[PDB]
Structure formats: structure tokens, C-alpha cells
Amino acid sequence: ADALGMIEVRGFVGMVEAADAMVKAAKVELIGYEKTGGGYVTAVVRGDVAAVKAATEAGQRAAERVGEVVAVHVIPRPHVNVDAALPLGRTP
Amino acid sequence: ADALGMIEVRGFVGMVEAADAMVKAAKVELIGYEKTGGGYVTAVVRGDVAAVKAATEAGQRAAERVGEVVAVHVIPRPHVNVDAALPLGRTP
Amino acid sequence: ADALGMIEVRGFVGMVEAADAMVKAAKVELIGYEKTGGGYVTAVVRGDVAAVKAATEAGQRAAERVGEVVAVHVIPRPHVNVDAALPLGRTP
Amino acid sequence: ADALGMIEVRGFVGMVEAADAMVKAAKVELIGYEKTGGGYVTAVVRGDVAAVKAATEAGQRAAERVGEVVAVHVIPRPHVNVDAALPLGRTP
Amino acid sequence: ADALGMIEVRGFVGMVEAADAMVKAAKVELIGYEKTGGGYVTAVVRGDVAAVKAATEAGQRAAERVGEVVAVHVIPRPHVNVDAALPLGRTP
Amino acid sequence: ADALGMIEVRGFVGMVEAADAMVKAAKVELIGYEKTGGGYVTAVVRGDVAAVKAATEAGQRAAERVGEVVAVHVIPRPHVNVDAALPLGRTP
Amino acid sequence: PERFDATPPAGEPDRPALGVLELTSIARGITVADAALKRAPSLLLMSRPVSSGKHLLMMRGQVAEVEESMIAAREIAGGALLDELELPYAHEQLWRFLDAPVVADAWEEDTESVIIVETATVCAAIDSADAALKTAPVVLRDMRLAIGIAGKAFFTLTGELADVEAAAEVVRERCGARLLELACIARPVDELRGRLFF
Amino acid sequence: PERFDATPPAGEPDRPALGVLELTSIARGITVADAALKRAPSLLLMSRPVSSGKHLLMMRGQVAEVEESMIAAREIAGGALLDELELPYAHEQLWRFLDAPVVADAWEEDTESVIIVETATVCAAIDSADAALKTAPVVLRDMRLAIGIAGKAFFTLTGELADVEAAAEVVRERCGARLLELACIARPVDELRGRLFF
Amino acid sequence: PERFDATPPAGEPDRPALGVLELTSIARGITVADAALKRAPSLLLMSRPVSSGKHLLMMRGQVAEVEESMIAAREIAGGALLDELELPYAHEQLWRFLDAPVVADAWEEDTESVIIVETATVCAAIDSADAALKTAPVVLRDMRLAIGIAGKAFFTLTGELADVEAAAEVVRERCGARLLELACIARPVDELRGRLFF
């Protein structure tokens, strides 16, 4: 349904700074964060596609300042099985 | 609510020395620590922005003497979605 | 409260030898050990400042022979927020 | 509790000018002054940390023009033994 | 409220001649004198601003006759917290 | 009561120019003029101390352009015996 | 004049973006305006000739529409584009300080400190005001945009002293060169709180 | 305010001519004004200090009277005469765009094209508007004369496209160098017809 | 708007002095304003952003209070202090030409001559007007202080011809270099007496 935006940072500080920069510089909603272990944590925002594109392009710039960005990606329309199976905050 | 300060250390010992230096050097509140695996731990203080600014610039100074500092950052005002979604000591 | 002493070793073996050397060379209380993942474990002793300083300087000398001693630190007086917030064995 | 600010002047006129410039230049509380004899008097302001830092760095700059500035210091969080044992305006 | 004027003299005699010349040279009110020890004493006049300005600029010239003038300063509208906290003869 | 200001000029022209400049450049009152013979004449203004200071300091600048100023002086608070004994325009 | 409100009514599309175009000429101000409204369906807030002979365009819409209109605008004004701005999400307190210059009549009874900042361009003023509102809990009191003061634009914030110092840091970072002067009053007098410009 | 009307009533002398004096100073603005009214009996329309610190004089009368007042005025001014104008017969539609800055609110349902043109002086704006009204069937919508935009002055014309391009030709010839920019919009958007400055 | 009166009521302290601070910036305009009100308890008349992007401060009080506030203000300003003025006893007729620009619309029927004078700074206009009102029996008719005409400021005096020649002498001696132009009309026309700016 809603488009998906993610920031993955090796480190909790860069992830929190990235999540704050995403929710400030656009009208998105931080649904949560995933801890895949090894110091990698992933902040997940979700909203309409131009807003999450602006949010992640702000969060990538604000997380390279203080941390180490592993991956940035915007899924403009995730399939319903992704939201049903993986935890993206829109679980039916 | 109040502004946010963080010290991420690869190691529990540098994190405890950083947390002790932050709570001694200025009027903050150590709401705790986040364990993101791989040995990375993030001590989190929370107060007004001048005290957490002085607290982190004392904690980075006192934590590089004992261990390895990954990242230090001060958010002057965390957005309400960050307090609601991430565990930063002010979940309503 | 009581003074604090920590040994962080990348490995359970070096931590156990460090903790044995700490509790044999002083009158300290080994409250336990913290598992921050990734192979790091931190042994914590806790008592008055001379005993914890001599205990940790015995444990550092006996833990470099079997492990990779990451950090060694003594806190002669931790602030009350540290003990109330972090797991150091004196949480009220 | 509240952060501390001090201006010590060898002379009463410079102390009153410094205390006037402090309580005009920021939002502090002048709790009074301390006489150690020999011409030394110390004006003590006490408030939050940014206000006392700005207030004392203005009071020092206004007391150099009229008197002799012995010492200026800002304590962001004085320990409760200092508040209860020394006459620093917040004796419970 | 009422403007403030001070003469600080290392010695009682120069302070008395200063205070007498101040109260003879303008319409001010000698509210008293502060002894900080070490031989420094400060006579304080407190009236409106033109009176205390002319009074202290006559008292400084008359106090350099017999004594050793340390500092002279006029505060044309001292803050209410100074008069509330320091002994300047208008404490409510 | 009222402060006293005087301009003494060797010549009636410089005195009248000084008197005009005094009563124009401030809010003072020219009570009169005294003729001590030998070509010396004296214009006397009388009012509150900042006004007579500004008036005489303008009258000196306007009477040196056209005449020969012998003396300029401002008395901020003359005694009652001066006004009672000499012609200063406040004779009871 | 209800097009400058922060949140729209329920029968309206939500338009959170804002783009400011400051132009040295008024004629291609109009050319930039209708080219931007030709390419993408933006809601144009103002097209107003302001002082020192310049033209101030403000448009509003969704993020993609404002981005497309602004890219059409900055490819037409090439040139005479003095300064530009493209915000995807303007802060809620900024929306009533756009149309007319607002002046404050009173502060609250807990307001500690106040920061006044002027920029050489309108876009730098709006950009720094938005950046300071986002990373500080400060309140925007009054704001003048190039009318009556010949192109320059100022605004004041109030709040706690450490908050307005953090806002001073972020304003001095976002302006950089367009900042003419910023003044950090830490305790304004009782005879001036709430009543600055008069 | 009825001294600016195009045709006078029956108990009035018909005054078709117009002279504009734009002066860098205001003191000899008044000296130029009363010298012009001393030499010849020209009905003075306005004597107004406008922005960028300049003074705007408009006088009205018959052709010989305006010519005589203007020759007196340009021998008094020269100097501090930034720009002058002497129209022996001003067009009828130009008579209401002099006193107050007019802005249009709606055009028509058949108006094809609009042309906005701005000049660095006031006399060039009035001259170009008069020339384009005389050699085109175009309509004058809105015209700002140096107040609020610091000495520059603009106006927009509307009409059929070939007409406003001939008007663009004659404006670009009469201005020459005082023209800052002219814009020939051949089809303005439905969201901007009639309502440009807002 | 009653704080600009010449003589105060009986239940008020008499405030004859006047200080004018003209500043190139508006941020340290406010810093100068509250520093002056911190040192000495002046009554502040205005803190107003006027044209060409400058700030204009007027304070009122007793002679010593205004002197102390002005010396605090000029040690905080220096920098951005464009021009300053400190008058210990401002003339009566000058007290109503400070707040809003006034234009006189009629003269008395004995008024011989008129002198219009413009200065490049506001402090020079206020200073020259005060000096000329002190050393002439002239009347101050109208006066513009930097709004609408970008920092320049003018005023016209009227009176008998020899009086306004003496006033021209004293204004040309007090301005000196800040005088842009002064014009001594010896007999203004019957169609322009009282009605100059319109």
C-alpha cells in the first residue's frame, strides 16, 4: 500500500539520527526499527512515495555525518505478502 | 520531551565510563543503554540541550581514554515519532 | 555506593581467569559478568577503592596471558544514577 | 541541583558590578556573596547551566573593566555534599 | 530603582572623606558602608542618576587627597535581584 | 536646591550669545547677569544638574566663537547661604 | 486568504510542500509562475512584487508536484533567479507568517530568551526559520519578508535559552553566507517583552 | 481625485496633454514644480515622493501650456532630472493608471494573450504604455509606478496575440534601453487569467 | 500614541531629552535597544524597521538618563551605527513629527516663504529641524522620516523670508555633508501654498 523507506546503519546512534531526520524532513511515519544483530540496526519509515523519497534522501545525508550507512532503499509499492510476512508496521 | 544525547561504545566498559562521566559532568538522566549486538552498546542520556551537549562532550573525552567510541551525537529536540517508536526513555 | 572494577575480555576463558585473579587478590565481590555479544564478556567486581584497584590490576596481568583484554577500568565512586540504571549488582 | 556560577573579585565594587551584569545578562538567581576576608568577595549565581554559563562569561567581562577578577568558574552539577556542606544557597 | 554609586578605599579615613564629599556635592543618600576586610571599605550612595554621577565624580577626586582609591563605579539602574540579594540599602 | 551654571565673558556680546545658547540648548532658566566692572559680565543659569551642565557646555562653545570666555563652572548643589547672600535669583 | 493554513479541511487534498522563488525581475516572475503552473498542478500561494524591485513567488502542493513545478521554474529562469527554496514539509507554525508581515503583541509568562535573525534573501529567512522550528522547541513570534525593508527579511524566535542557542546554531549553519546578523538576547528587559517593533 | 479623468465635463477646459518629471531629489522637485506653474498655467496633477528616494511630478494641460511648463522645468532641473516625458495627447485608458497602482481582478472570456513589461524609470513606462495603446487594439490592465518596488515601473497589456506582439515591438523600440524585461506570454493558464498579482 | 507629546501631564515626570539611533541592521538594533533600556531607565519611543533595510530607534527621557542610555547604546552598536543623535532638550514642534509622517494641508494667510530640505540620514534631518526651530521663528509643516523614500528624510519649514534664510544657514551648518539638497523658495505659487505633496 504505502511506500517503504529504510535506513540501515552499523550503529544505534546513526540509526536514531537517521530516523529523526526522516520524520522531520518529510511527512512520514517511523513504524519502528529492526535489530538484526552485529551492530546493524534498521529504521523503517512508511508513507507516500515522494515523501519517503525525500525522507530517505535526508536521512542518508544525516546518517553519513555521524555513522556508517550500509544500505538505503525506497520501495515505491511493496507487495501485500511483504507486509503480511515481514514486520513493516502495516501487519493486517 | 527533553533533548537527547548518546555515546556508542564497542564495549561495555567504555560505555559505563561514558555514562558515569555524562551523569557526573552535567544534569542529565541516564535512562539506560541499548545492546545492538556485536559488542556495540549505546548509553543514552536525556535532559535539556545545553547539559546534554556538555555531557556528551565530556563523555566522548572520558570514553576515548578507556575504549573505542563509535559515534557521539546530540539531538536538540527528538520528534514525537522517535520517542513513540524507538526506546528513548519517553514512551507515553 | 561501592567502588567499581571491570575487565572486558573477548572470550569467556580470559574473563574467568580475570575474575579468579580479581577475587583472589583482594576482598571484592564478583557480582557477575555482562554478555554484550560478538564474543565480548565483562567481569565486574565491586568494593572499596583500594581493593578494587588491586584486584583489577591483578586481573589485567593475569588475563593478558590467555585473552585479548579490551579494556580495564576502575570507578572509585559511581554516581547513583549509574547504579540505578545500569546492571552493576547494586540496583535498589 | 542547579548549576553554579561564581565571580570572585578582590573588592566589593567589582563584585557588585559583576553580579549586576550577571543578573541582567541571563536568567539566573543571585543567592548572595561570600566573604573570605582580605578584600575577597565572591558573588554566587545559581540556575540552569546555559544561563549561568552566559551570565558568568558576561559578569567576568564586566568586572575586568572595573576591578580585579580573581577566579570565574561554572559547575554544571555540584554534588549534594557540596550543596549541603558549603553555603551555596541551596542548603536543604 | 535608585541609581547606585560606590567608592572603595583601602582605609577608613579616605572612605569617610569620600562619603562626606558625596553627600555634600549632590542630593544623594549615604546608606552605609561595606567592610570586606583586609582594609578595603566601600561607601555606598544611592539616589537618582545625575546626583550619583556628580556625587561620585566629586567623591573620587576628594578621596584621592587622603586615601588610596581602589575602584569607583556608577550603576544607573541596578537590577531588582541585586537589591534583593546584596546589601545596598533598598532591601524590601 | 537647583544647580547653578555660569558663563563669565569679557564683553556684553559674548555674554548675551552665551545666555541665548544656554537657554536654547537645554531647559535651564537665565535668572540674570552680574556686572563686576572692567568689561567683565556674568550670565547665570539655574536648573537641574544635567541640564545646566549641557547648557554651560554649549554656551562655552558658542561664546568662544564670538568672545573671550574667562570662566565656566557648574555647581551641582549650592548651599542655601550662597543663594541667601549673593544675587543668584533664588533669594527667599 | 485561507490557502495559507497549515492543515486543510477534510474535503481537501493535503498539501505539505512549499516553494519560494525570489526573482530580480517582475516580468519573468510571471513567466516562471505560469510555466510552473503549466508543467505541474501546483497551488500558487502568492505572486507579489516586493521591495528593492523584486518578485516573490510562493507555491504550495504535494511533494512531487512542487518538485516538478520548481524544476520547471528553475529551468525557465535562466538569468534572474536571485534565490530559491524547496521544502517538502513546512513546519506548522510557519504557515501563518507568509502572506502578511505579522508582529507579536505579547509573549507568554514563561518566555526566557529571544533570538532575532535577518537574512539578505527571503528564501534564506524561510529556510532558516523552518530549520530552526524543526530542531528546537522554539516559537516563531514575528517575521518580515522584504516589504518595507527593501529585500531583506527578518524573524524572531522565543523560548528557553539553551533551545534558542541550538536554534542559533542551526540557523547559522543553514544561512551561512546569506545571514546578515543574528542577535542572541538571553534576557530581554521587562519593558520590551512582547513589544519589540513599534 | 477627479482631476485625473480622461474627458473633462462641459464646464471645463479640455486638457489633453501630459508631462512627467522624475527627479532624483525632492527639494528641487518642488523648485521644478513651482517654476513650471509660474511660467505657464499647467494644472499640476501630482507631486509625490516615491521609492528609491525620488520625486514624481505629473502636470496636465493644453499642448502649448504643458510644453512651456516643461521647458521651464527642464531648464530649472538641469543636474537632478533622472527622466522626463512630454506627451501632447495621452491615450484615454492611461488616465486612471497614474494616481493609484491599479491591479486587475478579471479580464474577459475571450482574451488571448498578456504581455508584462517593466522599465527602470516611470517616464519610460508611461511612454511605452501610451505608444502601445496608440498602435495596437490592446487593453491596459495593471500598472505600478515606482511605489513599493523601488523606482522600477511595470504594466501589463492584454489582447489578441498578434496585437500584443506588435505592441511588444513598439514598446521595445520606444524604451530601447530603459526596458528591463518584457515577456510575451501567448497563452496564460486558466489559473492565472485576470489575477496575476496577489 | 500619547508618548510623543511635548509637555507631559501633571502626574508624569518631565522628559525633555531625545535620542535617535539609526542602524544599518535590525538585529543589533534590538540589541542596542535593550542594552540602552538595561543601563539607564529611558522611555523608549520607537524601534521601527524603516526603508532601505535599516532600523530606527527613538528614546525619550531626562537629560542624564538619555545620555547614559545613548552611551551604552553607542558602545554596544560599534559596527552598524549609521548615524546617532542625542538632543538634551528637543524643540516643542518637533514632538509630533516623529511617530508618523505628517503632511500639512494648509498654511496661515501670512506665510511668506518656504524652505524644503532633505538629508541622507534621519538623525541629520531631526538635528537640523531642531536647530532651525531653535534659532528662527519658523513653523515646521511636513516631515518624512525614511519610510517610503529609502532612508532619505526631508522636512519643510515656513515663515518670513529672512527667517528662513537664517534657518537655511543653520541647517547647512548642522548637516554640512549629510545634506542632499536644500531649496529656498522665496514665494511659492498661490496654487501650491499649503498643498505640496499630493
Curated annotation (Swiss-Prot), chains A, B, C, D, E, F:
CDD domains: BMC_CcmK_like (cd07045). Keywords: Bacterial microcompartment. Transmembrane segments: none annotated. Disruption phenotype: Absolutely required for BMC formation; when deleted from an artificial operon (Hoch_5815, Hoch_5812, Hoch_3341, Hoch_5816, Hoch_4425, Hoch_4426, Hoch_5814) being expressed in E.coli, no BMC shells are made. Signal peptide: none annotated. Changing residue 77 to A: Forms smaller hexamer patches. Belongs to the bacterial microcompartments protein family. Its main location: other. Artificial BMCs can be made in E.coli by expressing (Hoch_5815, Hoch_5812, Hoch_3341, Hoch_5816, Hoch_4425, Hoch_4426, Hoch_5814) or (BMC-H (Hoch_5815), BMC-P (Hoch_5814), and 3 BMC-T (Hoch_5812, Hoch_5816, Hoch_3341)). Cargo proteins can be targeted to this BMC. Artificial BMCs can be made by duplicating this gene with a 16 residue linker between the copies (making an artificial BMC-T). The shell assembles into balls with holes where the pentameric subunit would be, and can be used as a model to study assembly and permeability. GO terms for cellular component: bacterial microcompartment. It is found in: Bacterial microcompartment. Residues 3-87 form the BMC domain. Homohexamer with a small central pore. When purified protein is examined by atomic force microscopy it dynamically makes uniform patches about 35 Angstroms thick with hexamers in the same orientation. In the BMC the concave side faces outward, with the N- and C-terminii exposed to the cytoplasm. This is Bacterial microcompartment protein homohexamer. It comes from Haliangium ochraceum (strain DSM 14365 / JCM 11303 / SMP-2). InterPro entries: Bact_microcomp_CS, BMC_dom, BMC_shell, CcmK-like_sf, CcmK/CsoS1_BMC. Coiled coil: none annotated. The keyword Ribonucleoprotein does not apply. The only hexameric shell protein in this bacterium, it forms the majority of the bacterial microcompartment (BMC) shell. Expression of 5 proteins in E.coli (BMC-H (Hoch_5815), BMC-P (Hoch_5814), and 3 BMC-T (Hoch_5812, Hoch_5816, Hoch_3341)) forms a 40 nm artificial BMC with a molecular mass of 6.5 MDa. There are 60 BMC-H hexamers per BMC. The shell facets are 20-30 Angstroms thick (a single hexamer layer), with 1 of BMC-T trimers protruding to the exterior.
From Swiss-Prot, chains G, H, I:
It is found in: Bacterial microcompartment. Artificial BMCs can be made in E.coli by expressing (Hoch_5815, Hoch_5812, Hoch_3341, Hoch_5816, Hoch_4425, Hoch_4426, Hoch_5814) or (BMC-H (Hoch_5815), BMC-P (Hoch_5814), and 3 BMC-T (Hoch_5812, Hoch_5816, Hoch_3341)). Cargo proteins can be targeted to this BMC. BMC-H can be modified to place its N- and C-terminii in the interior of the shell (called CPH). Fusing proteins to the C-terminus of CPH allows targeting of cargo proteins to the lumen of the organelle composed of CPH, BMC-P and BMC-T1. Keywords: Bacterial microcompartment. Disruption phenotype: Required for efficient BMC formation; when deleted from an artificial operon (Hoch_5815, Hoch_5812, Hoch_3341, Hoch_5816, Hoch_4425, Hoch_4426, Hoch_5814) being expressed in E.coli, a >10-fold decrease in BMC shells is seen. Its main location: other. GO terms for cellular component: bacterial microcompartment. Disulfide bonds: none annotated. It comes from the Bacteria. Residues 17-99, 113-197 form the BMC domain. Homotrimerizes to form a pseudohexamer. Unlike its paralogs BMC-T2 and BMC-T3, the pseudohexamers do not stack. The concave side faces outward, with the N- and C-terminii exposed to the cytoplasm. Belongs to the bacterial microcompartments protein family. A minor component of the bacterial microcompartment (BMC) shell. Expression of 5 proteins in E.coli (BMC-H (Hoch_5815), BMC-P (Hoch_5814), and 3 BMC-T (Hoch_5812, Hoch_5816, Hoch_3341)) forms 40 nm artificial BMCs with a molecular mass of 6.5 MDa. This protein does not form stacked pseudohexamers in the BMC. There are 20 BMC-T pseudohexamers per BMC, composed of mixed BMC-T1, BMC-T2 and BMC-T3. The shell facets are 20-30 Angstroms thick, with 1 of BMC-T trimers protruding to the exterior. PANTHER family: BACTERIAL MICROCOMPARTMENT SHELL PROTEIN PDUJ (PTHR33941:SF11), PROPANEDIOL UTILIZATION PROTEIN PDUA (PTHR33941). These proteins have 2 BMC domains which evolve independently of each other, giving the term pseudohexamer to the trimerized subunit. Although the homotrimer fills the approximate space of a BMC hexamer protein, the BMC-T trimers are more compact. Their universal presence in BMCs indicates their structural importance. The homohexamers form pores of at least 5 Angstroms in diameter. This is Bacterial microcompartment protein trimer-1. It comes from Haliangium ochraceum (strain DSM 14365 / JCM 11303 / SMP-2).
